[PDB]
Nucleic acid binder design. Structure first.
Ligand SMILES: [Mg+2]
Ligand SMILES: [Mg+2]
Ligand SMILES: [Mg+2]
Ligand SMILES: [Mg+2]
Ligand SMILES: [Mg+2]
Ligand SMILES: [Mg+2]
Ligand SMILES: [Mg+2]
Ligand SMILES: [Mg+2]
Ligand SMILES: [Mg+2]
Ligand SMILES: [Mg+2]
Ligand SMILES: [Mg+2]
Ligand SMILES: [Mg+2]
Ligand SMILES: [Mg+2]
Ligand SMILES: [Mg+2]
Ligand SMILES: [Mg+2]
Ligand SMILES: [Mg+2]
Ligand SMILES: [Mg+2]
Ligand SMILES: [Mg+2]
Ligand SMILES: [Mg+2]
Ligand SMILES: [Mg+2]
Ligand SMILES: [Mg+2]
Ligand SMILES: [Mg+2]
Ligand SMILES: [Mg+2]
Lengths: 50, 80, 50, 107, 155
RNA sequence: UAGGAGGGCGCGGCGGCCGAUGCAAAACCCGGGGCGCGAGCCCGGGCGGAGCGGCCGUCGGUGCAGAUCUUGGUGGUAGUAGCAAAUAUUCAAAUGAGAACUUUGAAGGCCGAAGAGGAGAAAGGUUCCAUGUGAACGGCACUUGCACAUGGGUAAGCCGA
RNA sequence: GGUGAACAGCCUCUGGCCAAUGGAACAAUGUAGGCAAGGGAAGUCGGCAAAACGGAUCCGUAACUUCGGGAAAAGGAUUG
RNA sequence: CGACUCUCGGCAACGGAUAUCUCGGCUCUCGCAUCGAUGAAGAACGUAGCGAAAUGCGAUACCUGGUGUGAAUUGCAGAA
């Protein structure tokens, strides 16, 4: 909706930031296991359910 | 008909985010959260699903205050 | 109200009008329009933007 | 070799029996194949005026005989598959019509 | 990095490889089986002439359903063949890369020939297609490794 | 055959005994040589690169070809079925490694205004806009994209709550 | 916008598109659409499917009837 | 001779079984008793020079302060 409540706007703000590739310098960091962001979300595939 | 023709009319939200638990389980028409039991005084919890109990028992969150209680027991609640 | 009151205490200026929106990223962004006694270029050079 | 020649393409026979939604596209394909048989040139460019002419009467009724002029000329592009290609353009018709008019060679 | 078959003479043979090429394994196999033991120049003529849809690659092993042509009578009498253009265009690239390798080594690129050509399966890639009655089935590719060695022919 | 018993073979521990091992252990592969009727065992060669075996006592989550067995992989089917509604595309030029699919122009057409137009409610949540692109995706293709990456954008005393 | 009783169908203007993978061929069997000599339901469980009638003006309009209908009965003529 | 099929070996693939491990599990045993209206458990949102998660923290926000140890952090830069 274009008329979204502030709660939903605030909580859709965070799921914006939650969707970015890992910083490249995470991969070179010692004793690391992070291979990619295994929690990405695409808007056509996974609906946030709210 | 039932099925494909009828799944197109899912348009209105029966459940929305509860404020006590943040789950999408707040039945608006009935005004009660369907997981934490809000707005009941006590949290909805049942012994017929220990799996559901462990998902929200103590220790799954920050424990912003109880994490320090063992340290304060050690040395027996001292303040100078 | 607080945005004007604060832009007055800093910068030794005053705002003729202020508009606020909440960006999608979460932060609030405010447009502060100055009275024509004060020049935005001079203020922005005295803070350093351009 | 440079050479320009005026042809009369009996385009009714070549397009007999074709599907309506394809008679004009196959008219274009037959103009290309006629230029290819005419001067053995792989690269044939049909001028936009010839396309406009063929496509003037819709997609399902095309001109029946078309008086075209095909010009075999050099490809001066430094990169080129063939040294020489053919440019087919629509040709002026004398007021006499197409009666008694065979293939000509334009100076 | 070592090929299935070692060259007859290692210093006077060039070699080229590709892994996980997104082309049909069966089509490229049928290409390679026509290109084995050919001269390099004749292989380039032949294969570019295949991609030009003027000479046909016989299909023998993976052939059931392949329609017939007259273009392949000289080498498969019942005339069952196709013109796999993507396969041909991928194999051309390795033939050129091995020509380049042989040029760098210093061989007679006029006297090179297909001493050993091998296509082999690779890790399949997964896609999904949707069928009647709410069922899905996998829709997967068959990428291949293509592995070839040119050697200089000798009397 | 159903069944019962005896003697053995084999897997993994524990208490003991005898050993092997970076001059190559375990595992696995072999048109290699043998032993036993047989379960199985011993040796040879290769890969392997750090552990392992034998004997006595004893213990056990101990032996697979089936259970429309469970998990994972792979085949034949098979380059086969197929990709067919919504009339329709055609020509130059530009870009590009590469053009039936991109962009410009030209021509032919369709929607025909209870539309394939212009905007909204719910719903979605950044899909909007720009620049770039290795892969993946867009059931052909792509220089392209609702894809991937980096940035930007939503201003209210009067429109709503 | 035109025809038309008409927000029917058909065609065009503003706006939007040519997006549904393409090349060659026109074999059988298909899916969708047609047309057929003479006959006219003989086909088949069955006129299933298709064809036929169809707008308008003028005339005419039966049995039965709850006296309201049947009725756009049926049957004819005309149309640029 | 050759293609196709069956088959044997060598080599190459696909696949990840086995072999050796293991900051994890399970099981048993022991010591203690310490949440919350002085706002708990849970949830949400923020927070780092370069961070999305997890770990941490709360507009003093991957930390402030005392004490202890005594020369680092670390993927890059930097002030030191
Ligand atoms: Mg309803
Ligand atoms: Mg309801
Ligand atoms: Mg506002
Ligand atoms: Mg479905
Ligand atoms: Mg068992
Ligand atoms: Mg077993
Ligand atoms: Mg088994
Ligand atoms: Mg059995
Ligand atoms: Mg087929
Ligand atoms: Mg179909
Ligand atoms: Mg209306
Ligand atoms: Mg619309
Ligand atoms: Mg866009
Ligand atoms: Mg594709
Ligand atoms: Mg009228
Ligand atoms: Mg109308
Ligand atoms: Mg008839
Ligand atoms: Mg009958
Ligand atoms: Mg009968
Ligand atoms: Mg009968
Ligand atoms: Mg009967
Ligand atoms: Mg009927
Ligand atoms: Mg009656």
């Amino acid at each position: 909706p274009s008329h979204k409540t502030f709660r939903i706007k605030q909580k859709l703000a965070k799921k914006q930031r939650q969707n970015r590739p890992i910083p490249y310098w995470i991969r070179m960091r010692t004793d690391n296991t992070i291979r990619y962001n295994a929690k990405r979300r695409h808007w056509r595939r996974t609906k946030l359910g709210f | 008909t039932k099925g494909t023709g009828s799944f197109g009319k899912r348009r209105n939200k029966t459940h929305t985010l509860c404020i006590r638990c943040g789950r999408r389980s707040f039945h608006l028409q009935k005004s009660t959260c369907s997981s934490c039991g809000y707005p009941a005084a006590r949290i909805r919890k049942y012994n017929w699903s220990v799996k559901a109990i462990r998902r929200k028992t103590t220790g799954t969150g920050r424990m912003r205050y109880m994490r320090h209680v063992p340290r304060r027991f050690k040395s027996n609640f001292r303040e100078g | 109200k607080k945005i004007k009151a604060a832009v007055k205490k800093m910068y030794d200026i005053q705002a003729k009008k202020v508009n606020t929106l909440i960006r999608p990223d979460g932060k609030k962004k405010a447009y502060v329009k100055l009275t024509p006694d004060y020049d935005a270029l001079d203020v922005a050079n005295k803070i350093g933007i351009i | 070799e440079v050479v320009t020649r005026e042809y009369t393409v009996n385009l009714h026979k070549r397009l007999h029996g074709c599907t309506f939604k394809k008679k004009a596209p196959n008219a274009i394909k037959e103009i290309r194949k006629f230029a290819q048989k005419a001067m053995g040139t792989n690269d044939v460019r049909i001028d936009v005026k010839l396309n406009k002419h063929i496509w003037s009467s819709g997609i399902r009724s095309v001109p029946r005989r078309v008086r075209v002029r095909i010009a075999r000329k050099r490809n001066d592009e430094e990169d080129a598959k063939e040294e020489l290609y053919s440019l087919v353009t629509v040709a002026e018709v004398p007021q006499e019509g197409l009666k008694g008019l065979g293939t000509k060679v334009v100076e | 990095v070592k090929y299935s078959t070692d060259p007859a003479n290692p210093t006077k043979s060039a070699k080229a490889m590709g892994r996980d090429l997104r082309v049909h394994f069966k089509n490229t196999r049928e290409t390679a089986f026509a290109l084995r033991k050919m001269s390099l120049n004749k292989a380039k003529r032949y294969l570019e002439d295949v991609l030009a849809h003027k000479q046909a690659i016989p299909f023998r092993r993976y052939c059931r359903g392949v329609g017939r042509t007259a273009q392949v009578k000289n080498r498969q009498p019942n005339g069952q063949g196709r013109w796999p253009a993507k396969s041909a265009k991928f194999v051309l690239d390795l033939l050129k890369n091995a020509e380049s390798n042989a040029e760098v080594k210093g061989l007679d690129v006029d006297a090179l020939y297909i001493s050993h050509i091998q296509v082999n399966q690779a890790q399949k890639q997964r896609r999904r297609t949707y069928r009647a009655h709410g069922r899905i089935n996998p829709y997967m590719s068959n990428p291949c490794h293509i592995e070839l060695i040119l050697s200089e022919k000798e009397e």
